Design a protein around this motif. Structure first.
Motif, short mmCIF file in Angstrom:
data_model
loop_
_atom_site.label_atom_id
_atom_site.label_comp_id
_atom_site.label_asym_id
_atom_site.label_seq_id
_atom_site.Cartn_x
_atom_site.Cartn_y
_atom_site.Cartn_z
N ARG A 374 17.05 89.66 -0.06
CA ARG A 374 16.23 88.76 0.77
C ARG A 374 17.14 87.89 1.64
O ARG A 374 18.23 87.52 1.22
CB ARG A 374 15.32 87.89 -0.12
N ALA A 375 16.70 87.55 2.85
CA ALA A 375 17.41 86.58 3.68
C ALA A 375 17.44 85.20 2.99
O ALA A 375 16.46 84.80 2.35
CB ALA A 375 16.74 86.51 5.05
N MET A 376 18.54 84.44 3.13
CA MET A 376 18.59 83.05 2.66
C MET A 376 17.56 82.21 3.42
O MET A 376 17.62 82.11 4.65
CB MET A 376 19.98 82.45 2.87
N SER A 377 16.62 81.58 2.71
CA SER A 377 15.63 80.70 3.34
C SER A 377 16.27 79.41 3.85
O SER A 377 17.11 78.80 3.18
CB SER A 377 14.48 80.41 2.37
N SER A 378 15.86 78.97 5.04
CA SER A 378 16.34 77.73 5.66
C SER A 378 15.30 77.13 6.61
O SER A 378 14.42 77.84 7.11
CB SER A 378 17.66 77.98 6.40
N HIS A 379 15.39 75.82 6.85
CA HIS A 379 14.47 75.09 7.72
C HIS A 379 15.12 73.82 8.30
O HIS A 379 16.02 73.26 7.69
CB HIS A 379 13.20 74.76 6.92
N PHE A 380 14.64 73.36 9.46
CA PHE A 380 14.95 72.05 10.02
C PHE A 380 13.74 71.41 10.71
O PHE A 380 13.05 72.07 11.49
CB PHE A 380 16.16 72.14 10.96
N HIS A 381 13.52 70.11 10.48
CA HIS A 381 12.50 69.28 11.14
C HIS A 381 12.79 67.79 10.90
O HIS A 381 13.31 67.43 9.85
CB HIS A 381 11.12 69.67 10.58
#
Length: 747
Positions: A374-381
């Motif tokens: 699986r792709a490494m999960s990431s986020h920004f906000h």
């Protein structure tokens, strides 16, 4: 960046130690053979999640000797220590025992490439070729019987050359424990082709050279050309490096190179076309132990991934570096990049990538695991970033404060979303939500929900089910339903910018919602990207401006490859403007009705450097609805950087204006987002340790996020918002030539 998720198989309480593993070539079925404490053998079949397939259990009073799946059908051949052979058919739920004709341990078992025939061989040297029906039942007597009088070690079929007759593909090679190899022709005549100085460890056929590769237990390699008449000639003979006295596992890569696991804390490589050798070893910087040994090796050709299993219960992996335009093509060791370990229970004994889903199965002395990538999960906000570090670990950075936190989860993370107040995680069965409470992160809520994707705005959570988006509290309580038709397809993208949600579907539709009210309200009605922009196969990514006035979409091609087009849909005009990196063109097209409406084009950007690039990520500024950013990769002029970051001002009066173009920083793996004055990027864990010299006694959380100021904000990282807005309005009006409104904005 990718992570590997350990689906341990649900072994029965009666199943002893595992002994061998084998994937079906096409379907995601893993066969596993066990040996009980009573020395009875058994075979079971498992799904990719490690769940046991019903009614697939097979047993005998004696051990499993070999496994072989049929090339296309859901049929498994099993060979046994007594000389029984049994064919199990999963589709019909039937088991067929072959006629008792072997009287000793089945050392060899192999389906023909056509799947019409099965070859079986024993420890006494009896070889049989069988013809089988569509159910896995024997069609009379063997097609061939032969008796070498010596222990059969290995067999491979010779594939027919790529071209009308009904050839079953009965050309093959067979090896014996004395070190000899025999060819067999389409008439079943046997002819010797090799004589090695010791027992054969492994055998391969190189189709492009019509050549047979032999490796012995004394690690002697040999290569033979074999014309069709079966009269072999020796091309090469070489003594390979490594420790004798252990069963070396061996793989052939791409019909050009040999790889070996020999128990020496390194894999050994030998390029058959160059005559060149090199080694790869695990590095303590990635968490491997000093002198940790590799016992088994396997390669996935579709992914370009090499894997190896260790005596400490880790899987090492190396990725093949692409042949980029504008670098001298990497040679030997430099073709490979080491990945972070996968950790498992007990000494690893076998591994295999064998199914077309490109899943890896791993077999230890204790148990079997299936590793799903699986792709490494990431986020920004809202100046908060979240980055995954392991299947159950996150790094959360509050960039407004410079603080970083480590956030372990009681679930295997499938996605993450972050806000100034909280972080949400989900595994596709449950969701958990964590609140920032001063200098610590604490659980705020956890609930069952089969959501593929999630988003957040204030105390509201946006979650997905078949044909709907559900607004929920942090405790999971449903406040509101947003509905889709079957013809609009299921939501599979969510993005939130300012007070607006945008939603995108399988079936390539999209919608948007105003969140500034007690209930979410539809801001954009449903639109089909395939009606807007012909030839689009789907949505690859979707985002909105902080005003909700513009939606940006990355289309996908029909093969799910990335598209050089990016689409911007205007919610107030009901129109799409398309930019294509391969041409530099800006289009406009309309959907004020579903008819074949009018279209326009302009030549307003001429940077020929963009023609080889393709967009892969995109974002909007959380405060300035005109400001947009994209990350674009060169599809394998100044010096060509592999990746470019492009920022744009978007307006109804002037269309698309390129604000800045720059190469992605060399230490940055992807664009994570933008929020003025900064671009934000994902940093590698391999590079965070190289520059930070620090005092002993701090558990330094690696700074997995890096930031770059926008061009016009270099030296203005802290400038005052009201004055800055008036200066932005001024500079905008001056670049437009509207000096009166520029002068008014400055008053």
């Amino acid at each position: 960046m990718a992570l590997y998720y350990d689906h341990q198989i649900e072994a029965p309480d009666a199943a002893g130690s595992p002994s061998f593993i084998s994937w079906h070539p096409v379907h995601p079925f893993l066969a596993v053979a066990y040996i009980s404490t009573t020395s009875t053998g058994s075979v079971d079949i498992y799904l990719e999640q490690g769940e046991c397939v019903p009614d697939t259990h097979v047993e005998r009073p004696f051990r499993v000797a070999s496994l072989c799946w049929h090339p296309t059908r859901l049929v498994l051949a099993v060979g046994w220590e007594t000389g029984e052979v049994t064919v199990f058919n999963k589709q019909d739920k039937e088991q067929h025992t072959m006629p008792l004709t072997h009287t000793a341990d089945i050392t060899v078992l192999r389906w023909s490439p056509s799947g019409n025939c099965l070859l079986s061989g024993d420890r006494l040297g009896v070889l049989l070729l069988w013809r089988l029906d569509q159910r896995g039942r024997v069609q009379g007597t063997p097609l061939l019987k032969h008796e070498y009088g010596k222990h059969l070690t290995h067999c491979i079929f010779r594939l027919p050359p790529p071209g009308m007759g009904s050839h079953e593909g009965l050309l093959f090679f067979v090896s014996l424990m004395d070190g000899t190899v025999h060819y067999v022709d389409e008439k079943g005549k046997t002819t010797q082709v090799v004589s090695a100085d010791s027992t054969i460890q492994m055998l391969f056929y190189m189709e492009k050279r019509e050549a047979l590769v032999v490796v012995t237990e004394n690690l002697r390699l040999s290569l033979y050309t074999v014309p069709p008449e079966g009269k072999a000639e020796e091309v090469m003979k070489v003594k390979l490096s490594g420790k004798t006295g252990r069963r070396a596992d061996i793989a052939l890569i791409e019909g050009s190179l040999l790889v070996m696991a020999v128990g020496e804390a390194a894999l050994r490589f030998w390029d058959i076309e160059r005559g060149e050798n090199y080694i790869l070893s695990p590095d303590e910087k990635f968490g491997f132990e000093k002198g940790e040994n590799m016992n088994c090796v396997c390669y996935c050709k579709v992914k370009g991934l090499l894997a190896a299993g260790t005596d400490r219960g880790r899987v090492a992996m190396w990725r093949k570096v692409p042949d980029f335009l504008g670098s001298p093509g990497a040679e030997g060791k430099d073709r490979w990049a080491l990945q972070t370990p996968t950790e498992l229970q007990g000494n690893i004994t076998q591994i295999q990538w064998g199914s077309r889903k490109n899943l890896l199965a791993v077999n230890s002395v204790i148990s079997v695991a299936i590793l799903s990538e699986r792709a490494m999960s990431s986020h920004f906000h809202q100046q908060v970033a979240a980055m995954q570090v392991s299947p159950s670990l996150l790094n959360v950075c509050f960039l407004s404060t410079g603080v970083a936190h480590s956030l372990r989860t009681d679930m295997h993370i499938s996605g993450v979303f972050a806000t100034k107040d909280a972080v949400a995680v989900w595994n596709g069965r449950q969701v958990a939500i964590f609140e920032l409470s001063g200098a610590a992160i604490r659980s705020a809520g956890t609930f069952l929900c089969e959501t593929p994707v999630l988003a957040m705005h204030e105390e509201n959570v946006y979650t997905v089910e078949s044909n709907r988006v559900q607004v929920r509290t942090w405790q999971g309580t449903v406040k509101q339903l947003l509905l889709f038709s079957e013809t609009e397809g299921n939501p599979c993208f969510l993005d939130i910018c300012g007070n607006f949600l945008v939603v995108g579907t399988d079936l390539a539709h999209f919608k948007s919602f105003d969140l500034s009210r007690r209930e979410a309200k539809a801001h954009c009605s449903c639109r089909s990207l395939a009606e807007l922009v012909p030839g689009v196969g789907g949505i690859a990514s979707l985002r909105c401006s902080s005003s909700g006035s513009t939606i940006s979409i990355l289309p996908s091609k029909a093969d799910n490859s990335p598209d050089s087009k990016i689409c911007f849909y205007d919610v107030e005009m009901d129109t799409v403007t398309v930019f294509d990196f391969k041409t530099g063109q800006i289009d406009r097209r309309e959907t004020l009705s579903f008819n074949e409406q009018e279209t326009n084009k302009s030549h307003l950007f001429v940077d020929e450097g963009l023609k080889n690039y393709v967009p892969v990520n995109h974002f909007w500024d959380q405060s300035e609805p005109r400001l947009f950013v994209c990350e674009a990769v060169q599809e394998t002029a100044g010096p060509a950087a592999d990746v470019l970051i492009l920022s744009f001002f978007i307006s109804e009066e002037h269309g698309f204006l390129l604000h800045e173009s720059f190469p992605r920083p060399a230490t940055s793996h992807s664009l994570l987002g933008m929020e003025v004055p900064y671009y934000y990027f994902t940093r590698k864990p391999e590079e965070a340790d190289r520059e930070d010299e620090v005092e002993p006694g701090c558990h330094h959380i690696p700074q997995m996020v890096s930031r770059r100021p926008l061009r016009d904000f270099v030296g203005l990282e802290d400038c005052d918002k009201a004055t800055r807005d008036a200066m932005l309005h001024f500079s905008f009006f001056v670049t437009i030539g509207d000096m009166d409104e520029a002068f008014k904005s400055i008053k």
